[PDB]
Amino acid sequence: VKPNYALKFTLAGHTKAVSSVKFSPNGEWLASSSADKLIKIWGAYDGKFEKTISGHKLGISDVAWSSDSNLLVSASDDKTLKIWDVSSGKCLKTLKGHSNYVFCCNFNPQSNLIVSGSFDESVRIWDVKTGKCLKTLPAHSDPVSAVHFNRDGSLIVSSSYDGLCRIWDTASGQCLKTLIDDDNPPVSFVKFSPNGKYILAATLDNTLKLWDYSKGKCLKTYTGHKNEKYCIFANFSVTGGKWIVSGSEDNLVYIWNLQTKEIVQKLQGHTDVVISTACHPTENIIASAALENDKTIKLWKSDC
Amino acid sequence: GAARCRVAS
Numbered sequence A: 001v002k003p004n005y006a007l008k009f010t011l012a013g014h015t016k017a018v019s020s021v022k023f024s025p026n027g028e029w030l031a032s033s034s035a036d037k038l039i040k041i042w043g044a045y046d047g048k049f050e051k052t053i054s055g056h057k058l059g060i061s062d063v064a065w066s067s068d069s070n071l072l073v074s075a076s077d078d079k080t081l082k083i084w085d086v087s088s089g090k091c092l093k094t095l096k097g098h099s100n101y102v103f104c105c106n107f108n109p110q111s112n113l114i115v116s117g118s119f120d121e122s123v124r125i126w127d128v129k130t131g132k133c134l135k136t137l138p139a140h141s142d143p144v145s146a147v148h149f150n151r152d153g154s155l156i157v158s159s160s161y162d163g164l165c166r167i168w169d170t171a172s173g174q175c176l177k178t179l180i181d182d183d184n185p186p187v188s189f190v191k192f193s194p195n196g197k198y199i200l201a202a203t204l205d206n207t208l209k210l211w212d213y214s215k216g217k218c219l220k221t222y223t224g225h226k227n228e229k230y231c232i233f234a235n236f237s238v239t240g241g242k243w244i245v246s247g248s249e250d251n252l253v254y255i256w257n258l259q260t261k262e263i264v265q266k267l268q269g270h271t272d273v274v275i276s277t278a279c280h281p282t283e284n285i286i287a288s289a290a291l292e293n294d295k296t297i298k299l300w301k302s303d304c
Numbered sequence B: 001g002a003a004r005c006r007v008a009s
Helices: none
Strands: A006-011 A018-023 A028-033 A038-042 A049-055 A059-064 A071-077 A081-085 A090-093 A102-107 A114-118 A123-127 A133-137 A144-149 A155-158 A165-169 A175-179 A187-192 A198-205 A207-212 A217-222 A233-237 A243-246 A253-257 A263-267 A275-280 A285-287 A297-301
Touching: A018 A285, A028 A059, A028 A297, A071 A102, A071 A114, A081 A114, A102 A144, A114 A144, A114 A155, A123 A155, A155 A187, A155 A198, A187 A233, A198 A233, A207 A243, A233 A275, A243 A275, A253 A285
Parallel strands: A018 A059, A018 A275, A059 A102, A144 A187
Antiparallel strands: A006 A297, A018 A028, A028 A038, A038 A049, A059 A071, A071 A081, A081 A090, A102 A114, A114 A123, A123 A133, A144 A155, A155 A165, A165 A175, A187 A198, A198 A207, A207 A217, A233 A243, A243 A253, A253 A263, A275 A285, A285 A297
């Protein structure tokens, strides 16, 4: 069984590179962030432009949805995060305390906490309601490329250019596990699997790895794509066949069979590094987005 | 720009 993703929509409007795209949990929307300092909201099924959200003073590297689809949080070169009400476009809170670019962000499933990672080598945990920083973890010795809560919120996984992935106890801020691998190439992305047992980690040696972090064992590797330079998002696709999905520096989207690790599809049509991909929560839809020479988002749809 | 859209310097 292989998918047949085909291009259905191209979404123009960002005036610099996109940094990331995320589907809302309720499946209705796609949020995009860009170096052009803006967030844009689009119809997930027809690509219809919905609105522009502004207020960051410098470009944005990441954006994430709350579990009820009502809020966004963004991470910006201006050293802040911003919490936005999606329906009104208003900035509800500005999260201050990082001393360098904020690179990555995420809500916990409860949506009362935000986790962020920054060039300042720290991971910060923020209270959504008050906007205050609850914890600063001296998480890494280089920029923090990704941060993600597990399915029950008790754990955070972080990755860094220092070559490490770390698992943290949310409540205490304490490090539960450090995953090191080979010669510790920069770790450019990480997230938990949907069941919470694995982490998918990208490294800048053109490699994705599925880890049982619980035992410290690499279960799968996904290769054949180009990833040496940028922190490119990877995903679990679970609505049809079980795929791994990633952008690539050869301007393609790659799709691998999760179990066999074979490439099952390469999506062509972007004209620059596909910095970000997202998988729709209920339909076989991929959103992909690219850097400066392209600046567009594409929506692709498959029968399986 | 944005950190994610740049390479490490």
